[PDB]
Subunit: 109 residues, 3 copies
């Protein structure tokens, strides 16, 4: 579906997921959204409105990120993105989130 | 589990998912529910009460459908069902939902 | 990620998932948590705070379990754990939950 949607506007219709931007690049598992003051990696496992394996290498390590889930969000310092998981520091603790639950991961430009 | 449950009554115990019907057919990834005034394709990735690869070919294109998610629902005109995704028109916009998040997709008979 | 976290404290940061314990064993798809008065199998598909294929063989059949989902919980008598699914009796009815939606499954010691 996303293959030929580069340049399309895209938004999350989930009320708690404040993402409205443009699709800039697309990868097998996820796609990159330019949201103006922030970028996001949007998961193909997701609910998206529209109007090379992964792009997570784009997310800056050490930066404060917002990981959106289907039912909430995790905000903290990005530690690492592994093969299956995103690790974010909240307080002095590591929050692990499996990638299949990461609906979107945004960071400021 | 669903292999030998044809003829069983089945319901969604999620409060916002108003599905109560009978299992009529079963496929590798999903099963078909006759709910009287509506049919549904129920995802094997789901929470179900009970008391050939896919059945999504049964859903009429162009019809108004209700896509139930774990935490809400998407209602609009069915555009297409692809290999990985369901596309529904809400307003004049395409809502994409990955199949793994489609808990059930119902349409009126 | 979990490979070398045996002995780490682990908790669910989801408000409705009251799990705080220690990682005792780890398997390809899930890991075992000792929570003092209860044990849990935690899914690697999950959100976890930290500070051989599966361990579901540890859960006693017939026991009252609590199956935590991303947005709620199912409590009843464990019937079976199959390859893809957990079956729990609530009332005199079978509740099926696909394993990918089982965030954690706890039982009392």
């Amino acid at each position: 579906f996303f293959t030929n949607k580069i340049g399309c506007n895209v938004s999350s219709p989930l009320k708690h997921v404040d993402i409205v931007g443009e699709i800039v690049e697309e990868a097998v598992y996820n796609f990159l959204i330019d949201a103006g003051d922030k970028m996001c990696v949007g998961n193909k496992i997701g609910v998206w409105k529209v109007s090379r394996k992964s792009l997570y290498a784009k997310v800056p390590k050490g930066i404060g990120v917002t990981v959106y889930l289907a039912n909430g969000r995790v905000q903290g310092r990005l530690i690492d993105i592994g093969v299956y998981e995103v690790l974010v520091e909240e307080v002095g603790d590591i929050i692990y989130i499996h990638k299949d639950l990461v609906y979107a991961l945004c960071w400021p430009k």
